[PDB]
Structure 1
């Protein structure tokens, strides 16, 4: 007896899921439009129903806003609109958060109830590298204290307050640092998806997850994430590591054997301990847990019972 409705992938496919409603030409185009070999049979068979489920929560919240506003006789201090519905997305580095978040963004946007869907990563709230050196935290990049938690919280509070303007900084996955002066502006979207390692973490007072209406945790076996983490590092030889500007340049040259060793070391010393200590404990706090197989595909969904 547990707080989850659990489905494996078979069962979830085996449906009897009221109206189907398919993806268009068109919508499938735009979804490879970000398609790092993004599996479209997975988008259609897992992510789309999952997006409908969430849509039911967004729609219910919009109708609550209205039943509540009507009851109070719409006073001058109640907002005219629902404030943004915020969805958190948590999980290890290299688990596919970003893809999950990007797919959901694209799918949720197709409803008339909420076509304006934003996506912000908390990576942009990490302290800049120089700032991090100054605090003796470089070896702790991506641990909770590596983020400007106060700015992170002010941002989400601003969005949840029905502000019309809220700005976050930006983090380069090329330079592995904050890009000075770059900014992402959010403008009272109907939905904000907030993606990051730390979004479901707790603190002593009001924490950002207090401002979430729904959250996901992307899960997998820790040996599988290590493998995806390694592959991603290797593939970086061709891309980000290829620039001589990079602090990781000397890595371009490494053979598959030596790049592995260098990767398995950052995993072991930084990302794995971060996962075990700080990220995985936040997993039972999510509304929905998606567990991925070694081959990247979803094999299990746990949804909090309603």
Structure 2
């Protein structure tokens, strides 16, 4: 016995799933602009059922708010509307948290119950490079201490407080740094998806996950994430690294053979460590673990028994 209900891809395909849920032509090729590492199959066959499943929780949490308000007799101090339902997304660098996160925002915004759905990345809560350096933490970017955990708690707390506004800084992957003065504004969305390596990490007191209504962990065999890591790094040689303004411009010149050694090394000494010490252990804290194949196909879903 286990606290999980477990499905594999076969079992997931045997769908007696009681609603069609009609994916229109527009969104079905608009769900292209955000991925490459998602078939339209995966969307139709997995992500769409998942988002239905989350809908039921968002909807239920909205009814509960109301039935509570009307029970308290709609007092002055109680808010008018439910607070933002907040979804955490966790997993290793290279696992596709951003993509999964972008697919969910896309799908979940489709119901009328919750049409406004924001997406925030904890990237923007890394300490600026000045700070990391002042703190001797450059070698540890991505590690828990590498973030302003307090600012991040203030932000999420402010959002779960039903604030009309709340903003988070913006990180730049091209410049490998926080963009100065740059800020995303969150405006009491219906649902906020919060994505980052760290979102399900533990703390001595309150932690961001205490404010999550639901959370996902994107999982894969560790060799398979390494394989995606490398390939993204070689591809960046063309894109991000090519740009002369990139912190890692000098990495563009490297040949396939050379960039692979460099990548396996950055993995081996930074990112694989972070994964093993700090990300993996948060795995069983998620409402839903999604394991992926070598080929980026969900082979296993683990859902918290209700």
The Cα shift of 1:26 comes to 1.0
Q: List per-residue Cα deviations over 1:130-153 (Å, max 9, x = no partner).
A: 211111000000100000000000
Q: Is the 8 A contact 2:59 2:113 kept in 1?
A: yes
**Deviation per residue, 1:69-107 (Å, 9 max, x gap):** 000001100000000000000000000100000000000
Distance (whole Å) between structure 2 residues aligned to residue 39 and residue 219 of structure 1: 18
Question: Where do 5+ consecutive residues of structure 1 fail to align?
Answer: none
Distance in 1, Cα, partners of 2:54 & 2:106:
13
Q: Do structure 1's residue 247 and structure 2's residue 247 form an aligned pair? A: yes
- Which whole-Å CA distance do the structure 1 matches of 2:188 and 2:301 have between them? 30
Give 1:17 deviation, angstroms. Answer: 0.5
Whole-Å separation in 2 of the counterparts to 1:248 and 1:35:
24
Root-mean-square deviation (CA, aligned residues, Å) is: 0.8
Give the Å deviation of 1:37: 5.1
Give yes or no for contact 2:38–2:296 (8 Å, CA) kept in 1. Answer: no
Contact 2:37–2:296 under 8 Å retained in 1: no
- Secondary structure in 2 matching 1:20: coil
Range with greater deviation from structure 2 (147-156 or 17-26) = 17-26
Pair 35,278 (structure 1): closer, same or farther in 2 beyond 3 Å: closer
Report the Cα offset of residue 36 of structure 1.
2.7
Moved more, 239-248 or 99-108: 239-248
Contact 2:84 2:159 in 1 (8 A): yes
Q: Does the 8 A contact of 2:174 with 2:247 survive in 1? A: no
**How many Å apart are 1:282 and its aligned residue?**
0.3
Give me the whole-angstrom Cα distance separating, in 2, the residues matched to 1:34 and 1:218. Answer: 17
Deviations 1:24-65 (A, max 9, x none): 011112211224353111100000000000000000000000
The answer for the alignment partner of 1:268 in structure 2 is 268
Q: In the TM superposition, what is the alpha-carbon distance from 1:183 to its structure 2 partner?
A: 0.7
- Inter-partner Cα distance in structure 2 for 1:261 and 1:40: 33
SS at match of 1:231: helix
Cα distance in 1 for residues equivalent to 2:194 and 2:82: 18
Task: State the 1:284 CA deviation.
Answer: 0.4
Residues 182-213 of structure 1: CA deviation (Å, up to 9, x unaligned): 11100000000000000000100011100000
Give the total of aligned pairs: 306
Q: How does 1:134-149 map to 2 (within 5 A)?
A: 134-149=134-149
Deviates more, 1:229-238 or 1:168-177: 168-177
Where does the alignment leave 5 or more consecutive residues of structure 2 unmatched? none
Shift of 1:173: 1.5
TM-score by length of 2: 0.99
| Gap change, CA 1:208 and 1:37, over 3 Å in 2 | closer
Moved more, 142-151 or 236-245: 236-245
Helix, strand or coil: the match of 1:168?
Answer: strand
Cα distance in 1 between the residues matched to 2:203 and 2:35: 36
Q: Secondary structure at the match of 2:181?
A: coil
- The farther-off stretch of 213-222 and 36-45 is 36-45
CA distance in 2, matches of 1:36, 1:12: 22
1:219 aligns with 2:219: yes
